[PDB]
Structures are given as structure tokens and as C-alpha cells.
Amino acid sequence: LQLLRNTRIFVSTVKTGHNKTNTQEILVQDDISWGQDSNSTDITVNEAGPRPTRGSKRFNDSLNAAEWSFSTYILPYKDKNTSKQIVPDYMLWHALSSGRAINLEGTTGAHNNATNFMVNFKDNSYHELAMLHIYILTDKTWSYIDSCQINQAEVNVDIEDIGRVTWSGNGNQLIPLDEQPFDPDQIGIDDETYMTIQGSYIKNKLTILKIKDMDTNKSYDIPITGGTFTINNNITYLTPNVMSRVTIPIGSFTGAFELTGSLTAYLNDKSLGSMELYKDLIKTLKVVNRFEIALVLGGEYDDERPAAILVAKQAHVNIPTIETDDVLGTSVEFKAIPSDLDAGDEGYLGFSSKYTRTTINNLIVNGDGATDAVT
Amino acid sequence: LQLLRNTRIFVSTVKTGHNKTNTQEILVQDDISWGQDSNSTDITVNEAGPRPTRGSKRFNDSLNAAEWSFSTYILPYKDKNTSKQIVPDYMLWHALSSGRAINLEGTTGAHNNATNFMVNFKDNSYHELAMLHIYILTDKTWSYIDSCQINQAEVNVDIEDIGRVTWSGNGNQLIPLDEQPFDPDQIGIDDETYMTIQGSYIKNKLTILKIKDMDTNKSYDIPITGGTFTINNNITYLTPNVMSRVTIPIGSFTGAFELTGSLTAYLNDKSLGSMELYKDLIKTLKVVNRFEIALVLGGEYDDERPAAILVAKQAHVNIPTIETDDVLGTSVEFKAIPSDLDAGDEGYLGFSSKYTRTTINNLIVNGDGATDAVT
Amino acid sequence: LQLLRNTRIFVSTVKTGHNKTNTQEILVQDDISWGQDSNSTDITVNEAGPRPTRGSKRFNDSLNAAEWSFSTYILPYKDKNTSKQIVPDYMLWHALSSGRAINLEGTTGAHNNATNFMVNFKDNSYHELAMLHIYILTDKTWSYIDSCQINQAEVNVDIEDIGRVTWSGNGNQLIPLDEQPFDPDQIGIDDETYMTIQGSYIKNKLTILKIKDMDTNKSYDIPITGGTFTINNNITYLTPNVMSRVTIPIGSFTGAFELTGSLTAYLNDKSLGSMELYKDLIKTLKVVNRFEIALVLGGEYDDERPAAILVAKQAHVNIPTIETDDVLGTSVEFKAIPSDLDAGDEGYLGFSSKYTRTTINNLIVNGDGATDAVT
């Protein structure tokens, strides 16, 4: 028998070669779900005779796209090889953010500094976004999915649980493989790295919102009681239709990048509170809203603390809806809107093991934690 | 913070002026739900190029109709000012039943007497039925919904709970207001009224059904084990479509009055029992059924007891369906059908704190508790 | 009052005459659900006037098909009158499998020997498959459903509960019959038969799968951890449309015979295991798969044990899907495909109180439990 407790998920770019730089291990939770489905057509005969021909041949006409959704953690840890903080699943973020292949240093989709690891969507303008091969250890069978381009990355601010993203991706085909592709233990998570990983956890009870109105330069102090965040590169797979053969999908195309999320907060009648935001949105009706929303999973402490900051420079905010709990709270929905519909300006993510108030403010102002005017 | 325990819902007829006659307080339960939604259109670009333009501007194009649904009680209490028994939410019943403004004495939609308060739908043939403004205390903020026209009033005979109606209405717009419209303490429920309110409760375990066949003059003795009742003035809101502005709904129109309900009873094989009704409906198939259905929430006692009587002079009754519980019970559905499709003859509700058998018979036969032949 | 504990369901072939040969009693569980519904059209008026005509006459225009679904057991017991083992509900299986009336001895849909009772689907080429009248004793009322042709029979291998089938059929009409059609106690289950019934139970924890690949002559050792099986004679009832009358359905027609099921098993990496089947199905993509699936509700023992064998000579098997439980298991779906779309070769069922390994192999190889080559 094979146990789910022993499952390992490895992410790689090339089929043949396999070293620690090109592929690593993902510290998946017990939410893994993969598989493939087929489109089957049933042929039935319906003729008006005295003796009907009751039968139905079934034909497999095409294959769908292989689907996988594992739920790893948010673990920004310092890299021993080069003093630049890297999350264990940086390649998944890169495949989400850019089509160019693994340019860690050069400012692109997956750019990391000594201080901060940060994810830009400026280069997210390609079809077939950074094909990645994912190897899954169903105990000891080594089954992988070929050419996985990821579809969704969802952060859920559970307000009472550790930071965890839930990836989703549409692979071309799921291939079992009799033999091992590479060496598991050497490639996957060493103990020395695992120590920093265990030290880099994010609580999500220290999340603080920084909603600001670009129209009026008004900043709101909102205590988040829960929220949701999702990135959805809408991938639709093109499958040729051959009548007498079983066809696998070819190509993946793309859709509309949707950096979207939801934010829930309690109703406070103080100044620059949640109720003031509700009144501002309900009283003034605007076709387009311009908000700067900063989701900092960690706190903004005058100390080195792990955090997974999020920013959306301009984000349309829907009308808040009053939710009647024991203590009333409003849930706002926000969808990042790129500028000029060409450049990637929806937002960017920042992961690092050490975040301070100054560095968080730096990333909020400009892309990295380099400088900030600060009066 | 703002708590749901302190919520108060005030129903008013006029905006500026505010006295005890024009508006009162509704003793709502903890099922309040109000809010507004907006229709947002997302613009995406899908062109066949080497570099796709992955972006999506989002626009707010129109506003929907504000939705509110609180669940108050059925509390017919005698009025100190005039000796006519009035429910605390009488003008809500009036807005359900008529468009003319609060003609309490004159026989219309909300007609009251010393003996009975009754709700007639004879004048329920207007568009824009009796606009009412509803003020909501989310703790202390005084946010209201402008020009609420109620949509549904549902009575649920739970058999084990106090009589409670669950209103629903589609308001034009939700306006927060910084300041108080009126004085909450003087306008809403005084202690002297509250005493009679506590004294006028309806148990719902004393309900008795009085189904009679107008075709065959056959009366059935049915012990109700549960049931449902709903009045639905279908309201669809007309919103202008302006491309470059956010439009709020103008006007409300009106649809088909639907006094509908469901009744469940155990299967008794006695004479004039539920099984006899089932056999009568299943054996004889008629295009139109004519039944007189009377739902008396209180009991018919030789004494003064509170009750919330319903009568439907002619009501089409669907075919009963056998529900296989531990003890088998049939569920019948009935929808009151008006005569001539012009006058309001679907039915009428009778609320009062003191009902006797004679008064219940009076209201079942004729409109009020004046006289009945009984020879 | 009437209790569900006393409900008895009798299955009969003829209306007037009633003996033990024509009808018996079905040992139904507490899942009985019968009833009838009607198609009602509501007429509403929507005209643009200052005074809308708010009203809605409701008309009953037609009747649907009466629906019933009881859940009896799988109880193959030896018949005292003739030494041929017969299940208590053999008429239901006969109506499922054939249109010709009760040829128990010879070769048809319900063909039984001294060894095995069997359900053959070769003769399911008729509309209006073997009309049966089912009498339901809701305590003491004796109401039946007229001309019931069954639509579905489902076997659920719960892996921890006794074998039980869940019939479903669309009867023409539900008729009360205040008087008794026949004598209940004499017709239904005597104590002597009930003893063998208590002796004939099937545990379902001894089920064995015998998937074999007709293409490659490869046999898989698969331990079932659960599964499903269903036979679905798609019955669509033709109801005439008369405007001014209530019409009951006339005729029943028939659809495509669908012997379908599902199989769930744990992932074993042994030889000829579930993992081998998964690899064979996922690595090789074929338009049509030809599998011989033999699902025995009982076990194969070198002794006389009750069992309910099932076989599908040609069964298309869909692509297995990995289910991520604590121990990973794959769920395969299989739909029997008849040969030439004219003869009934989807499969056949075998019920008997005594199966040995030799008799099970007999029924798997050829139709009867007579001989098999074995050398």
C-alpha cells in the first residue's frame, strides 16, 4: 500500500538533467490532489421500430488537461549558497509571474535581493508561461505531470493559521514512470535548510492592512479579521479533435491576469476606520476606484520578523457589504487593475525572512527594500 | 465596535418629519440582513499576437436594488391611544397590502377595529406600493435604506416556536447618514407597550387547519404538523443604462401577487381526515380546485386568546405528496387564486390579541368580527 | 396514524387475480419513497396600465409519471415448491431484463436452475418492459401504483453493510383502493421462507474483483475497498397535451440500456495490482477498451456460501483517478458495452444461495453454472 504521509512533490524545468539548483522539494500539506480526465462520447441508437436497438458503444475521443492542486507553506528563508532570501517554491512563483526562464537576479518576475525576495508581474505577457515539470512521489512510484504551467495561487488569511498558498496548474499529461527520475533525498530539503524553514513561519494573526485612497490621499486603519487573495492566470488548453484517435492537448495559451482578493474587517466607528471607508464608498459612486492596498502577512515591527507582504498600487474596490455577525463586519472585494493594459502594474509580492517597518515601507513605496523618502 | 444585539429597525413613511404616529420600532430578531450590490463589467483584451496584452480594467456600470430581510414577531397588542388592536409593524402590512397611505379606519389594506386588525388585498393593485423608509441602528450610526417597498412576508408555522414573519424588501439606495434622523428612545417601544407585547405571544402549537371544499361543501379536520406561508409581491427594479455614469434604480414597478403556502399533516385514516383529502385529490383530477383554507396561528378557544388568523376563500390545492417519516405525513401546497383577476380575493390576514370561536368564525365567513349566521 | 415500520410492498403482474405465484412480498428497508406530481401552469397578466391587474389563475394541465424507489435486500434462497433458488423479488429483475412475461424456466431474462438464479439481458429489446403492478401497504390503506415499469436498479458495495439493491420505476398512476386487493399475510413471506431468507444474507466484505484485459489476456488481483453498480433502462413517459383536461401518461417507450458501475481500490505496487492497471490504462491510450469485469458480491470459497455474482464480458473502463485518502486509492468507472448494438451482451447477473469456486468460474466463463474447461 501507499501512504499520503510519504508524498513528496518536486518541481523541475528540464526532463533529463536534475540537480539541486534546477529542482527542489515543495513542503506540501495534506491537500494534494492530482489526476487526469478524458472526454468520452456515448453512441446511442433511437429509431422508431417494433424492436428497438437498446445498446450504447462508448468511445474515448480526447483527453483533458491534467490538474493538480497542492497547498504548500509560505517559508521565506535565507539561502546558504548565496546570501539572498528565497522561498522553497520560488520557481512556482516565477512560472506564475514570467515566461522567461529562471532569471533570479535580473529584476524580472522572480527577483531576489540580499534583503527581499519579490515577485513582479511586469513580464507576465507570454503564452505558455514557463513550463515546469512536477514530480510526485506517491510513496515510491515517482509519477510526474508533463509541462505544468500553473493556473492559480491563493493566499488565505485565516487569521488563526500559518501562511499557506494553494497552487493549481494544468499539466499536459500525467506519466507514471517505472523508475526514479532523480535521487530524492539529496535533491529534497536538507535538515540545515529545514531549520531556517521552521524558523521562518508566518502567523497570519499579525496581518495589517494599509488601504489608501489615491484619489484623496486618505489612509485607513483597518484591523483585518480575515481575508482572501488569489492570482489567476486563466489558462485554456487547446485540444485537437481527431475522430478516430485519442488526442492530448497541445499548447496552453493564456487569459486575463486577475490579481484578486477579498478583505473582511470589523466595523469601527473611529476616525479613518472601516466604517469611514464604508461611508466613503457608499456615499461617493465612482466608475473607477484607485486604491493602494497592502497585505502584510507579518507585522510591521521595529525588528527582524518574517513576513509575506503584498501590494497593489491601483486596485478597484467593490462596494462593502455588511455581514451580520455577533460583531458587525464588512467584506470588501478588490481586483488589481493594470495601467494601460500592457505593462504589469497590478501589484507585486514581497517575501523575506527579515522585515522591518523601514523595509516594509520601502517595498510599499518602490519595488525593492532599497530606499524611501521618509520625510 | 458595533454589536448586533443593539440593532434597532425603525420603519417610517416620511423622510423629514418623525413622530410616534409616522414611525415606530420593529422588535426584530437576530436575523437581520441588509446591504447593496453593484453590477461591475470587466473589460479584457483577447488578440492573436506574439505578446498578449494580459490586463483587465474593471468598471462599475450600475447599482442594484438594496436588499433587506429582518424577521420580526407576530404581536397583536391593544393600542392605548385608540382601543383598536395593532401589531407593532402595521404599516409594513399596509405596504404589502395597499398603495394608499395609512387609511387605518377605512376598510382598506390595513384596516383596524376594536375587535380585529385585518389585512386586505382588495386595493393591492398599484405600482410602487406605499414607499416606506426604514432606519437601521447598526449600534449607533443611523444608516437607512431609501424608499423601501417590501417584496415578501413569510410566515413559518414551526409548531415549536413563536409566531414570526420574515419580511423582505427592495430599497432604492442605502444612505449612511452621519447624524441622527430622530430620537430613538421616544419613538421606539415604550415599556408599557412592551408589557402587552410580551403578553400577546403566539405559540404556534395551537394552530388548527380548516380546509373546506367549496365544490362539495366538505370540511376536513387536519392536525397540522408543520407548514409554510408566504406573500410575494414580485418587484423588479428598472435601472437606466448609462455608459459613462453609475446609475441607481428609478421606479420599482410591480408583478403578480402570490399568496402561497405549504401545509404538512400526519396521515389519519379517520373520517374527514388527511387521508380522505388525499383520496379526494388523487381520485378526482380537476383543472381548477376551489378550497377554503384557514390558518389560525392561535387556538379557537371559548376564551380571549391571541391569534393570527389567515383565510383564503378560494385557493388551488396541489396534489398531496406522501413524505415517509417514522409516521407518514402528506405535504400539500396551496396558492390562493383571485376571482376575475382584478379584485383582491386571494385572502386576508386577521391579527388581534383576543379571538374567540365566534370571532374566528366571523372573520372566516366575513371580513371582520361583526356577525355570522350560526343558526 | 400510520407508521412506516408496518409498510409492506407487494409486486404483482396481473390486476384481478392474486395468488402466491403471481405476487409475493418484498422485504423493503426503511427507504421507501413513492408519490405523484402534476404539471401546473400559472397565468399572469402583464399590461402597461395605471392600474395593473395583479392576479394569477393556476391550472393543472397534465400529470407526471408516478415515482417510487424502495431498497430491498439481495436474498437468494432455495424455493421449497421447486428446487430452484429464487430471490424474493425475481419479477423486478425479470421486468428489468425482459419484456416477455414470466418464462422462469427457459433461457430468458429471468432464467433459474437448481444451482443458480440468473438475470440475462439478451431480451431487453421491447418497449413497455413487462408492466408490473406494485401494491403498497402504508399501514392499512392498500394503495398501489398502476403499471410500474422499473427504470433503475443500483447495487452499492458499501464494504461494511449487507447487499441491498435500490429499485426505481415510473408508474402510470397512484390509486388508493380503500378496500383490500388481496389477502396480505397469506401472500407475503411465510416464516419457513423467512428462515432461509435470514440464512441467505451477503456480507459485502467478501467481494472480489476479477478485472481481466481481453486485449492482452492479463488478469488483475484488485481488492475492492468500495464501489457502485447501476442498471438504467432510460424510460421517458409520453403524456398527451390537452388544453382543457388533465391527462395521465400513456405508454412508456424505452431508452439505452446502461449497465454502469464504479470501482474503488487501494493502490498496491505489487504485480498485477491496482497500480499495474493504472499504469496500463494511463500509458496506453485506446479509443475502446475491452475488459471482462466479474464483481462477486460474495466470496469464492471451497464451500457452499451465498453470493451475488456479476459479470460484464465487454466493459469499457475509464481512466482511473487517484483519490488522496490517508491510503491512496484509485476509482475506476466502467460501462458495459454490448456487441453489435443488437444482442444483449452487456452482462448478466447470477444470484444463488450456494456458490463454490467451480460454480463461480462456470458462471464467469459461460452463462450457466454447468461446466467450464479448467485444464
Author numbering:
A (entry chain C), B (entry chain A), C (entry chain B): 3 to 377
What's the paper's own text on this?
Bacteriophage T5, a representative member of the T5-like family of siphophages, serves as an excellent model for studying the assembly, infection, cell wall perforation, and DNA ejection mechanisms of this phage family. In this study, we used cryo-electron microscopy (cryo-EM) to determine the structures of mature T5 (a laboratory-adapted, fiberless T5 mutant) and urea-treated empty T5 (lacking the tip complex) at near-atomic resolutions. The T5 head comprises 775 copies of MCP gp8, arranged into 11 pentons and 120 hexons, forming an icosahedral shell with a triangle number (T) of 13. The T5 tail, which comprises 40 trimeric rings of the TTP and a distal tip complex, is connected to a unique five-fold vertex of the head by the connector complex.
The T5 tail tube comprises 40 stacked trimeric rings of TTP pb6, which form a right-handed helix with an axial rise of approximately 40 Å and a twist of approximately 39° for two adjacent rings. Each pb6 monomer contains three domains, two of these domains, pb6D1 and pb6D2, constitute the backbone of the tail tube, whereas the third is a protruding Ig-like domain. We only built an atomic model for pb6D1 and pb6D2 from residues 3 to 378, which contain a β-barrel structure, including three α-helices and two long loops. However, the atomic model of the Ig-like domain of pb6 could not be built in our structure due to its flexibility. Despite the symmetry differences between the T5 TTP pb6 and other tubes, the pb6D1 and pb6D2 domains of the three pb6 monomers exhibit a pseudo-six-fold symmetric ring. The three pb6 monomers within the ring interact through the central β-barrel structure, with only long loops of one ring extending underneath to interact with the adjacent ring. Structural comparisons of the first, middle, and last rings of the TTP pb6 reveal that only the long loop exhibits slight conformational changes, indicating that TTPs may not play any direct role in infection, which is consistent with a previous structural study on TTP pb6.
